[PDB]
Amino acid sequence: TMVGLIWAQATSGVIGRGGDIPWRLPEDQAHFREITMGHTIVMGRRTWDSLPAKVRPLPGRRNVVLSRQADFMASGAEVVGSLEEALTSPETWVIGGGQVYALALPYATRCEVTEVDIGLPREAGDALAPVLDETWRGETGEWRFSRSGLRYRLYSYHRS
Numbered sequence: 001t002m003v004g005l006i007w008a009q010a011t012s013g014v015i016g017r018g019g020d021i022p023w024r025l026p027e028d029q030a031h032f033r034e035i036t037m038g039h040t041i042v043m044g045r046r047t048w049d050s051l052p053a054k055v056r057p058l059p060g061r062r063n064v065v066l067s068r069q070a071d072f073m074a075s076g077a078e079v080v081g082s083l084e085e086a087l088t089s090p091e092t093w094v095i096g097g098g099q100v101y102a103l104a105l106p107y108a109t110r111c112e113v114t115e116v117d118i119g120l121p122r123e124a125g126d127a128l129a130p131v132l133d134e135t136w137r138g139e140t141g142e143w144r145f146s147r148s149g150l151r152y153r154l155y156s157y158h159r160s
């Protein structure tokens with residue numbers, strides 16, 4: 001059993017605002033699919049609500065949604081009341097959002113982090129990325145360009 005986290009952040013650490021992600025990076029969809037396809041994905045209820053209906057649930061993955069609400073209906077996902085209840089498959093990828101990343105970081109042995117070269121100053125209410133300590137090791141990838149006009153790069157980090 002392992003847990004990984006996968007997220008994208010601006011250089012400020014902002015990952016979400018107003019119930020959405022404040023940029024688009026279409027080229028990174030392949031990476032997101034390569035990492036998560038065929039595995040369990042776990043997300044917070046707000047992130048589930050943010051998915052367009054076309055990809056709710058995300059196809060080819062076992063979708064799990066965390067909520068404290070008894071009998072919340074998430075058609076296409078299994079709703080659980082604790083993160084630990086979701087960790088039943090060999091590989092579980094936490095796909096957001098801010099609250100669930102913070103909850104899951106202690107359990108994680110991999111982080112796949114896309115850094116987007118955009119200023120995006122923090123504002124009240126923003127969802128923020130977690131911070132990795134010195135227990136993690138890995139590499140920072142080369143800069144890639146997105147047709148959106150932004151450059152981005154991948155940090156692939158891991159620990160025992």
Ligand SMILES: NC(=O)c1ccc[n+]([C@@H]2O[C@H](COP(=O)([O-])OP(=O)(O)OC[C@H]3O[C@@H](n4cnc5c(N)ncnc54)[C@H](OP(=O)(O)O)[C@@H]3O)[C@@H](O)[C@H]2O)c1
Binds near residue numbers: 009020048068082097
């Ligand atoms: N890579 C990215 O940039 C990225 C990827 C994913 C999401 N996002 C963005 O992140 C934002 C959402 O993040 P968020 O922090 O506001 O919300 P979130 O983590 O997606 O969901 C929070 C909700 O999860 C449930 N939950 C949280 N902690 C729980 C715990 N111990 N036990 C049981 N259930 C728990 C609660 O649901 P209930 O209220 O139903 O109890 C909580 O209200 C959005 O802007 C999204 O677009 C960004």
Ligand SMILES: Cc1nc(C(F)(F)F)c(C(=O)O)cc1-c1nc(-c2ccccc2)cs1
Binds near residue numbers: 029050052058059095
């Ligand atoms: C349009 C879309 N399309 C595809 C598909 F089907 F086209 F590949 C996929 C896929 O399969 O990973 C995924 C999405 C989206 N993901 C998010 C999202 C948002 C937050 C966290 C994780 C994913 C939004 S919109």
